[PDB]
Symmetry: C3
Subunit: 140 residues, 3 copies
């Protein structure tokens, strides 16, 4: 049993005032471990390597589309860099609707890189349960 | 080459009589290995650690929504615990429709924990091909 | 820090003339490493083992459905084998629409196996940004 590898699973909460979400990180099912830092809406990478990244956001209801982006930031570039984008057009039947949107992929990251999630529209996101909207990464 | 880590990929089959699905586990592409147990519709975790979990269910067609939950059960709690929920409202164009719904995330699990998948409606699930509905986990 | 494990993240580009997509593999965020080969629209597995596989394709707009398949080919079988299928029916509101479709699961593969992605309709795929359509795998 080795690792000790950095790992984090974060879950949704009521957002206060493309916007980034902020996160639960220790309560319920969320957690961070092995030097992973969740701070200031970011995941802070402690070790350069290849990570698998994910998030699902569930959206629920007059807009055109919903969109998620998981986004990397480094002080090397400080142009921020877009790793994953889920974008879906919306079908105006209700209109009490909801759609999950889910991403995950692998990326090579520098120690010190920053990760956040951004949505088209913070007021659409379902913040109510921890298993509907979340965001996670681990070192491979 | 180490691991020997527990790993399982399960695939869909015709369900007999929120309901849990049951699974193929050795035929075709499914499998379990390294002490993973598939029994009684559960995945039985043999080693406490962090696992990545997934399932896609494809649904196909007068209902409101479809929903998947991947769900953990322990004899510690025996309140069952909801790890992942995909829920989507349905668009009544056809109505011969179908939608895949896909989840996966990482979780810290006790050896002895139980995992199952639950759907809003067993009669909606496409059981026909193994690559449309499935469910899987591995130790990280 | 061990591995040295085979790993690849590939991203979308303008397709030239079920069709397989072809891929970016070194520029931007794509890459292959540790003996992984991307050639002739395939991912060529260099080591038998269990791999986690994924792809999202985003589709954008008079058709019935969209579909992705990730597909394995070996010279053992040369019947090609379907590992993952995302299929979704389409809702003809616009009709400037778009839908992401995302798969990933674990599979046991022979060294020498070949992997490709196939879609229902190459002209529907959004090729414009690298974070909308992609395809990836790593050795577990
Ligand atoms: Cl959808």
């Amino acid at each position: 049993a080795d690792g000790d590898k950095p790992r984090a699973h974060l879950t949704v909460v009521r957002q206060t005032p493309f916007p980034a979400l902020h996160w639960e990180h220790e309560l319920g099912l969320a957690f961070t471990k092995n030097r992973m830092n969740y701070t200031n809406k970011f995941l802070l990478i402690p070790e350069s390597g290849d990570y698998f990244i994910y998030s699902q956001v569930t959206f629920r209801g007059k807009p055109d589309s919903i969109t998620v982006v998981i986004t990397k930031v480094t002080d090397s570039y400080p142009e921020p860099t877009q790793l994953l984008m889920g974008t879906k057009s919306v079908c105006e039947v209700g209109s009490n609707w909801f759609q999950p949107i889910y991403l995950g992929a692998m990326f090579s990251l520098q120690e010190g890189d920053k990760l956040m999630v951004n949505v088209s529209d913070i007021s659409l996101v379902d913040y109510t349960k921890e298993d509907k909207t979340f965001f996670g990464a681990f070192l491979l």
